[PDB]
RNA sequence: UACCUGGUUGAUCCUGCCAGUAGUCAUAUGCUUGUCUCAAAGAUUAAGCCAUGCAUGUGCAAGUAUGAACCAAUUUGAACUGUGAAACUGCGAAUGGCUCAUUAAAUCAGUUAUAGUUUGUUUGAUGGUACGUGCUACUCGGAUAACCGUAGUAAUUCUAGAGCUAAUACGUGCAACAAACCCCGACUUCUGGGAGGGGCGCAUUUAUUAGAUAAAUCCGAUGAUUCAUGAUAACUCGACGGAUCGCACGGCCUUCGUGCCGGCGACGCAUCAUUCAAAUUUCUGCCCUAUCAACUUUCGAUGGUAGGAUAGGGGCCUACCAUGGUGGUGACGGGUGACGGAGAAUUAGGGUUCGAUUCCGGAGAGGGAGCCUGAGAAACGGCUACCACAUCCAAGGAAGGCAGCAGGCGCGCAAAUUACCCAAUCCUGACACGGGGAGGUAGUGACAAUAAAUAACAAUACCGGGCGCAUUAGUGUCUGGUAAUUGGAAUGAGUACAAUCUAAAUCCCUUAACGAGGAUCCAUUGGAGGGCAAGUCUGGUGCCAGCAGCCGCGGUAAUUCCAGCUCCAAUAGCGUAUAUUUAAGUUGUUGCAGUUAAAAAGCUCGUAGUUGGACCUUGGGCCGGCCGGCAUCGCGCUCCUAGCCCGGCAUCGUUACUUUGAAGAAAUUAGAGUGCUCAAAGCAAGCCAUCGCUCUGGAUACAUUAGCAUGGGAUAACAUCAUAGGA
RNA sequence: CUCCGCCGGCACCUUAUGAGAAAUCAAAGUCUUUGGGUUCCGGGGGGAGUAUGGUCGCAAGGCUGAAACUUAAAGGAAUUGA
RNA sequence: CCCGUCGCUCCUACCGAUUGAAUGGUCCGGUGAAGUGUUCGGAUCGCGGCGACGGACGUCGCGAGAAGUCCAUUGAACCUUAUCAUUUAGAGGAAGCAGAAGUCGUAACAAGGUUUCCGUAGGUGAACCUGCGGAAGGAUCAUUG
RNA sequence: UCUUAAGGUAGCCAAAUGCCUCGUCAUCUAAUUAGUGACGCGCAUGAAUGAAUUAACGAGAUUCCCACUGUCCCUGUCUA
């Protein structure tokens, strides 16, 4: 082409949106934003698809034009704003809060929470480096750039981030022994504990992560995101506690729910 | 153009050797005895039978302790037991292979209606099904090939509207009453 | 369903083909056609040619409104008020739609890289100095649309001149410290100094310098950077560093003065990061052809150095230098009725063939070429020139590009309406609102695909087999049927209210009153010698007419032609033609053949290729319920994992092979759940009091090769202990 | 010269438990129970080893080598008769 | 049963004087539109200094700047010669096939009446004949007879 | 069938060899008694009277084509 592309045809959309292949020719094209448009969920989907506060593309438009919806602390009018991992979606009119985290099946969930968990998010740092006049600052994987961090926060670490004062209020030093949620691949969502990290000079490094109930799996360092120091999380895990399972097991669970029903 | 993406498929296959007496009379056995309209009705059943037998045969090449064996086999066995196409104690997935075209043709809505009474013939049953005369649970099922499940077998009955099990009389019945009056 | 049958003979067993037999999301054609659901459709020949119409514009409370209107209408101090059209300004029109002509490691796919680049926008952070002799900001420019009015030209968003008036358009111009350090440097005293006052935002270009170790105070990053970043010396005729716009009021005087404040926001400039992206870029992989064995190199072919250009690497280009680069592992060249992939048909497996087309990548807009604007274009619903084709002209000139949607001509075996709408999906703009031939809806539509009518039940029957007496009988059982026999029941094809449906319509799905005697509400297409299912029927013809895929039929008694009758197969479908798949173990990897059926080279040598004897313990076992974990006569560990002196250590040969994992676009394939009434489908839906909500789902797998990581180390490759230059 | 044994040759005879369509074959055997290695070569009968291009030769010719078209058989082994 | 020449009819392909014909592509050479950048150029247009002169001028301030022009670069397009490839005409020559109720013989299949056949060479209306070497696919599996 | 010592073989051709003859067919041209390629009942071709070919060569004969030109249309002018 001779420039950018502004359309997203439905069959080409990320599979984890669960859009239906006959519901129309196009999909919502994720606007440029803090998340990488293949690991995001736009606002249109959250309202009309999941929450069903709307029935059409135009109805979700109106809702934002009343400004009921706030994302990550700030009011967003954009229809296709790219919400992502560990954002907060809050509707003060209804008085509800959500974190965005993954199913074990690797799909975003709106995890309902109180106000006290809305005050903060978690972010992993992309890099820490000097800048104008040697003033230290850090990149996150959320687009954010925080200047003047602890000299302890190195690359790949994770930070607590108050949305009111906006600076680092805590940080986890990414290393072996903490709990992590995976944000890509076939293992995305699966939480567990770093058991080993083997590096390879000139390539990606592999993380070894084990479910609380024994099952062992591996990803590459890109798709890893520490939640808490040690076994305990610093956020509320979703409806399933990050433990992925065989197809037989959920078959057993239904009939086990179908013997009581 | 969307709606191009919708799928469609084929349901039957014509026989390789068109004209052989032994195959040909065996087919008329089934067609007449189950009250069918044409050989297409029977061929689609055999095509669907061959599908599961290939499925069941494929798992039987896999071994026990295979997750696909375990998961796929039970789902197939449930599907067979659910439609009654497999007796009790028959849960080995070697008896799916033994399954025949008779069994599928004895679970059709047409054949079950006759086996329950209500019809006086197999050929009466069908026209009795297409004339809105028979519901199943609460819905007027008007396809002679409905393939009734076991759980819905008890509720097969007349409609709540059809003169023979429902409400008011038919056109010819009202016509004769008005000409008398 | 991992399958065959007819034809060489007097007969036989073979070889071997011809012919039959099935499908095609595979095209045309013929005959026929009632219902429901579904949906392909000018690709094939001509990337041939186009009449007409449409497909791209856009406005907020938040750039500019006395230019002329509209509605308030004024108490006639101020308002152009509140809403506005036009118009200037900003942004967009580089996406989508269409097609497949050129294009054969090329596009493309998986997989890499950018430390070798640009990136409007989003999101986050960030921002002093303009001159003042840095001793704290230094003043406000005309002229242009809409409008008024004079005009020319046949001419069209052709065009000239005069009169006004706006800016977030254009051009200027105020600028925030200790100056933090650095260089001069009157004098002071002697300096290791104090120094009076002169020189320093951010960008840009160049140069110098800093950015630290290794065991008996060194302090950011990478696998790896003269990296990030800092200091210094200057250099630029600097892109920059706000003269912009909204509502809301509401604390309090300093002159009680729209009075000092001070808020939230709209737009805008600049650096870094991010995001949406591209541009190049690594490895491997593509059909047929040798009656295509050499190709490239003067004039870029392969490399070197210095430049130039680019956004940036690079012979990309220039000057000088060297003589390289590719090739039987097929270079170079030719063919392609050749865009690539995801995929499709067929499939016991292995395969064979197709892939213009709705997703992704690329390329083009009649053929070439060159450009402007812009963040982004070598753009064609932008321009400039030429080539071809053609329109108007008042004859001087002017205006062009349907491989966008519809439609016409042509070409052909071969393909729809010059319809409605932005309601859904989304996109776009200054925007909640405008627009969208994207896209959706309807008409045509037997391309394919689904479900499914054309009767059912009864008794009479001249009758027909058993079964109750079986004898001698007779009828009577499932009604098997000629039966325009007879009797009422069933119902939709149809038609019609309404409702629903829908952007509005129509169709479906519901459903008031009509809607069946069999002549009608009537089902057809191919066959009846064999292959192959079904006539030793009857009339005609007489090697004629014809049929016949093949074998064959027809010369006066034709099972084969032409007909009637009857039967056969499939059935709302069926026949024909052509390409392809199967059959075909007649392309043979699995898996064929070569004495005589086709086929061992006259014979030997020989390079490449292909293939290649044996041999090196993991052998004899302790251990706990296939395996860890170990002792035998198991080359080390300091450095990470490191047990209560200790397992389980990294470099001092390379690989295939296998094991497990990663990361792998979706759609399609397989496959779970789910009663769209079934099915093809879809991705839903199901329970609640099918009551102010509850419960949710939207699994999972295969993915040849190449690349990445993990264990194994049987097998098999290449390399290599005898100058001991070994440990 | 006679007898016995081994190795290596040219063959012959008798027989299948073998193979083959058979004639025959102790190699044409160890083949649907299909895999030792490797080279050449066939794909119904003709047209045709022809045309054309290349190349070798003094020439005669050699090597490489189609197509259009045509046709239901051609052919192999064995049987009975004539 | 069967071969070939010849006569007749049709079909397909071959050679072939004709510097044959047409079409499309490519190499080189000549001319070369338009754009882009460069060089001069400077129509007129902006403080409209000064002289402090009387809306008028020249000394003018530098800054904008058109038509044109200069040299480079990209480069359509046209023309000549050549070459390539694909079609197509041709007096005449000459192959194969098929048809038909034709002419000449008798080559082959039996010892086919001269056993057949392979290579080569020569000769003849035609099938063929003959020389030389070879084969049995022979009409001999055989001489201690 | 008459005859001869033998009856002109391979080849070649309206040829520098063909009377008829400006042979017939094709090609070159606007038009060709010319040229080239074919045909061969050859007045009267033909094999060291050598037959048929043939690259290179030729102040040898002949036909055509491009260029060139006062050869020509059609002459004029200049110098010795
Ligand atoms: Mg978007
Ligand atoms: Mg097969
Ligand atoms: Mg024969
Ligand atoms: Mg016969
Ligand atoms: Mg066939
Ligand atoms: Mg596009
Ligand atoms: Mg920003
Ligand atoms: Mg260089
Ligand atoms: Mg360079
Ligand atoms: Mg093409
Ligand atoms: Mg095409
Ligand atoms: Mg066109
Ligand atoms: Mg383009
Ligand atoms: Mg263009
Ligand atoms: Mg157009
Ligand atoms: Mg069109
Ligand atoms: Mg008929
Ligand atoms: Mg017939
Ligand atoms: Mg037949
Ligand atoms: Mg039969
Ligand atoms: Mg036929
Ligand atoms: Mg025949
Ligand atoms: Mg017949
Ligand atoms: Mg007949
Ligand atoms: Mg064979
Ligand atoms: Mg042979
Ligand atoms: Mg030999
Ligand atoms: Mg070798
Ligand atoms: Mg490998
Ligand atoms: Mg011996
Ligand atoms: Mg063959
Ligand atoms: Mg052959
Ligand atoms: Mg032979
Ligand atoms: Mg024989
Ligand atoms: Mg003879
Ligand atoms: Mg003889
Ligand atoms: Mg003989
Ligand atoms: Mg002789
Ligand atoms: Mg002669
Ligand atoms: Mg002559
Ligand atoms: Mg002449
Ligand atoms: Mg001549
Ligand atoms: Mg003479
Ligand atoms: Mg003479
Ligand atoms: Mg003489
Ligand atoms: Mg001479």
TrEMBL record, chain A:
GO molecular function, one term: rRNA binding
Keyword Ribonucleoprotein among UniProt keywords: yes
Record-annotated KOW domain positions: 173-200
Keywords attached to this entry: Metal-binding, Ribonucleoprotein, Ribosomal protein, RNA-binding, rRNA-binding
Residues that bind Mg(2+): 29
Annotated HAMAP family: Ribosomal_eS4
UniProt similarity note: Belongs to the eukaryotic ribosomal protein eS4 family.
Protein name per UniProt: 40S ribosomal protein S4
Organism field: Triticum aestivum
From TrEMBL, chain B:
Chain ranges of the Small ribosomal subunit protein uS4 N-terminal domain: 6-106
Molecular function GO terms recorded: rRNA binding; structural constituent of ribosome
GO biological process: ribosomal small subunit biogenesis; translation
Keyword Ribonucleoprotein: yes
An annotated GO cellular component: cytosolic small ribosomal subunit
Region named Disordered: 161-181
Keywords: Ribonucleoprotein, Ribosomal protein, RNA-binding, rRNA-binding
Cited Pfam families: Ribosomal_S4 (PF00163), S4 (PF01479)
Keyword Thylakoid: no
Annotated ranges, domain RNA-binding S4: 107-171
Classification via PANTHER family: 30S 40S RIBOSOMAL PROTEIN (PTHR11831), 30S RIBOSOMAL PROTEIN S4, CHLOROPLASTIC (PTHR11831:SF43)
NCBIfam families per the UniProt record, alphabetical: PRK04051.1, uS4_arch
UniProt family annotation: Belongs to the universal ribosomal protein uS4 family.
Role of this protein: With S5 and S12 plays an important role in translational accuracy.
Quaternary structure and interacting proteins, as annotated: Part of the 30S ribosomal subunit. Contacts protein S5. The interaction surface between S4 and S5 is involved in control of translational fidelity.
Name of the protein: 30S ribosomal protein S4, chloroplastic
Originating species: Triticum aestivum
């Amino acid at each position: 082409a001779r420039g950018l592309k502004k359309h997203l045809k439905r069959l080409n959309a990320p599979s984890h949106w669960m859009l239906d292949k006959l519901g129309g020719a196009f999909a919502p094209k994720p606007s440029s934003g803090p998340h990488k448009a293949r690991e995001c969920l736009p606002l249109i989907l959250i309202l009309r698809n999941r929450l069903k506060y709307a029935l059409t593309y135009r109805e979700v438009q109106s809702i934002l034009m009343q400004r009921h919806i706030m994302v990550d602390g700030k009011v967003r009018t954009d229809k296709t704003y790219p919400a992502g991992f560990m954002d907060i979606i809050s509707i003060p009119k209804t008085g509800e809060n959500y974190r965005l985290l993954y199913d074990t099946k690797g799909r975003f969930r709106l995890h309902s929470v109180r106000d006290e968990d809305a005050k903060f998010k978690l972010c992993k740092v992309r890099s820490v480096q000097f800048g104008q006049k040697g003033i230290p600052y850090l990149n996150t994987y959320d687009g954010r750039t925080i200047r003047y961090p602890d000299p302890l926060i190195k690359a790949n670490d994770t930070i607590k981030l108050d949305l009111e004062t906006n600076k680092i209020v805590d940080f986890i030093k990414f290393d072996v022994g903490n709990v992590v949620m995976v944000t890509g691949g076939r293992n995305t969502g699966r939480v567990g504990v770093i058991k080993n990290r083997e590096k390879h000079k000139g390539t990606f490094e592999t993380i070894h992560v084990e479910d609380a109930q024994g099952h062992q799996f591996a990803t590459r360092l890109g798709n890893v995101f520490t939640i808490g120091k040690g076994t305990k999380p610093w956020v509320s895990l979703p409806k399933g506690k990050g433990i992925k399972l065989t197809i037989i097991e959920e078959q057993r669970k239904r009939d086990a729910a179908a013997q009581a029903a | 153009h969307v709606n191009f993406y919708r799928n469609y498929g084929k349901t039957f296959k014509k026989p390789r050797r068109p004209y052989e007496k032994e195959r040909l009379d065996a087919e008329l056995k089934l067609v007449g005895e189950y009250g069918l309209r044409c050989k297409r009705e029977l061929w689609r059943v055999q095509y669907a039978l061959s599908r599961i037998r290939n499925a069941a045969r494929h798992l039987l090449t896999l071994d026990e302790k295979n997750p696909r064996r375990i998961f796929e086999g039970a789902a197939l066995l449930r599907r067979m037991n659910r439609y009654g196409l497999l007796a009790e104690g028959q849960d080995k997935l070697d008896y799916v292979l033994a399954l025949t075209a008779e069994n599928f043709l004895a679970r059709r809505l047409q054949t079950l209606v006759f086996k329950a009474g209500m019809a006086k013939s197999i050929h009466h049953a069908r026209v009795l099904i297409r004339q809105r005369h028979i519901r199943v649970g609460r819905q007027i099922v008007n396809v002679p090939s409905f393939m009734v499940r076991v759980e819905s077998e008890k509720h097969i009955d007349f409609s709540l509207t059809s003169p023979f099990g429902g409400g008011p009389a038919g056109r010819v019945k009202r016509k004769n009453q008005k000409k008398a009056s």
